[PDB]
Amino acid sequence: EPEFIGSPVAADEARSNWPKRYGLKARCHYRSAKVDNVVYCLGDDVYVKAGENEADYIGRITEFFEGTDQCHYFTCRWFFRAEDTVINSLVSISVDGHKHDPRRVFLSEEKNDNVLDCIISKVKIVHVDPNMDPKAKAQLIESCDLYYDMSYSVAYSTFANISSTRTATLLDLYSGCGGMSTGLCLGAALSGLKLETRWAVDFNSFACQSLKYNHPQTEVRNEKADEFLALLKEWAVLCKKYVQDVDEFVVEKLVGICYGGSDRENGIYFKVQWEGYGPEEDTWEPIDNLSDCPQKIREFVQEGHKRKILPLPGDVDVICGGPPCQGKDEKNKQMVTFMDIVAYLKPKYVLMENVVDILKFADGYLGKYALSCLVAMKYQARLGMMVAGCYGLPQFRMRVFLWGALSSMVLPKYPLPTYDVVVRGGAPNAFSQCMVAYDETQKPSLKKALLLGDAISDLPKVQNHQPNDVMEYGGSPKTEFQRYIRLSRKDMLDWSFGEGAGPDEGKLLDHQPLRLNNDDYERVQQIPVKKGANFRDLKGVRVGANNIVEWDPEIERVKLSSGKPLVPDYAMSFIKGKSLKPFGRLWWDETVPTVVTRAEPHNQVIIHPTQARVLTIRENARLQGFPDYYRLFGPIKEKYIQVGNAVAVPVARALGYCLGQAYLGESEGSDPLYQLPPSF
Ligand SMILES: Nc1ncnc2c1ncn2[C@@H]1O[C@H](CSCC[C@H](N)C(=O)O)[C@@H](O)[C@H]1O
């Protein structure tokens, strides 16, 4: 009843075995205990009593001991239900046919000590293993109270396997210009893996064209994730049909396929080229519209399949996504779709970038939804948050990355910071322990934090109107960074081209700011060149409790040539008056917390330190860690955006490396984070 069975107390290997007491205190230990009718040995799985109304704990018994105080205790290490994880309440999720097994568990190494009184019963918890066959599993499972395939550690919300050259394809969704995608592909080389973005999906024409130009041999789809998927399913159907074992105007050839977005009759349409008509006369026609013509379709598909113009589940070996889910469910269906596509394609890995708020919004509804969906599919997962700066950028940009590695594959870690930028985690609650940093190990990365001067310093002077994509540097890269930022695709291994040089060798691209309508231009004209330039330096001025800007009587307004004033009324209103960023300029020793999609000086302190103009697109690209050889297209504003949205290339490029290691399975275990060997 109430107490310990008895037997040696094991002389002492007790201290040898577990001397945390022997300094929890132990008179001695036992290998068996008797509660009610029954005796529990060590290594027995058991149900334990939580607080009233709480679910019973589960445990593996580790310690049975006669602690001083004279009490009889046992310490078991804990077992985990998905609803006890970070993901509580999101067990209610289903993606496709995937649902959370109600009896399944994840094995922490987390232990606590209790009196034997709290032992309800003892449970059979069986351990699985990925490699098995129909019924090897089905047996076990059908014979057992519970099972565990993986350990859940809370450090990174990591669910991973527990025991008890080379090419991989990539799918970039919400690709934009492909900052993440490229960077990843660059790290892959360091790992020594050849990761190719065989597909990219984004619905913006311009982001798409940037991308394609910079990775010509990739299939760039400009459409929506929805359309893409549906298109994806139907295509599978076709491959079934045409591939092998049977499963007035004249259309000449079929150059394309889609599930029409604007074309929007929700049906497969095919691009049409017809005799006498240039590519400009082509049109999209519904599949049924097409006549019996096999040769056109049969050939189109067969030859497409050969070229893997489109993914099948078997072939995608990584996939990343940026799904915006701007903002239960309101829109955000975008994040949901991401997981729908993943669910379909079963990539060997998954990576997801998102703003930190995923975790803040309602207690990471979104974040826990992504995580939950991941695990529901039996996918090794973990997620942690990284700062762009730590990887050598003149900015502090914190975002969240979700690693989805398969059961059959290693789970990539996260790389530790390469720079000394000081990170004070907005480190929400549930996710407070998901972050990448050095706790207080003097990792030495003098890696003098980058500052603006270092980033844009070698920069031919340019003014408010510069309509030239490609100018010349007419200067040598003057800092370690800058010297690094302009490097041949060959030296950075962009590799997209065939071992031949890329276009735009040694050129300078997209160096040009947006044009301020003259009113604004003039306003920037009068901005001073001092360190702290703000509109405050301008005719009319203020002081007060607020620092609030109130016009300075005695001096009346002004007129631009147009007669508009210099100081718009809005500028005065901000924050009710803060030094603010209105028409503000930055120094070389300044950092941007984050590069923003939209550069207009009105509120953002975006104007070049010495030049009278807004930080040029390229200046932001460098700021975002873009190689100087990455070309951007479309209206200046549009590519300004393309850059704003992008995930920093150095960060993504470290990711690419850790991953790379993983795909080829070289790395330690159970360590949330890596450290990079050269400058990686
Ligand atoms: N409904 C949708 N369908 C397809 N793409 C969408 C979409 N809604 C948003 N997007 C994509 O979301 C992207 C913004 S985030 C893209 C950042 C990207 N990882 C990079 O830095 O390269 C946009 O490029 C847009 O193409």
From Swiss-Prot:
Similarity section: Belongs to the class I-like SAM-binding methyltransferase superfamily. C5-methyltransferase family.
Record keyword Translocase present: no
Record domain BAH: where: 38-163
Taxonomic placement: Eukaryota, Viridiplantae, Streptophyta, Embryophyta, Tracheophyta
EC number: 2.1.1.37
Role of this protein: Involved in the CpXpG methylation and in gene silencing.
GO molecular function: chromatin binding; DNA (cytosine-5-)-methyltransferase activity; DNA binding
GO cellular component: nucleus
Compartments in which it is found: Nucleus
Record's catalysed reaction(s): a 2'-deoxycytidine in DNA + S-adenosyl-L-methionine = a 5-methyl-2'-deoxycytidine in DNA + S-adenosyl-L-homocysteine + H(+)
Protein name per Swiss-Prot or TrEMBL: DNA (cytosine-5)-methyltransferase 1
Domain SAM-dependent MTase C5-type, residue spans: 168-666
Cysteine-cysteine disulfides: none
Domain Chromo as annotated: residue spans: 249-312
Active site as annotated: 325
Keywords: Chromatin regulator, DNA-binding, Methyltransferase, Nucleus, S-adenosyl-L-methionine, Transcription, Transcription regulation, Transferase
Organism whose genome encodes this protein: Zea mays (Maize)
Gene Ontology biological process terms from the UniProt entry: methylation; negative regulation of gene expression via chromosomal CpG island methylation
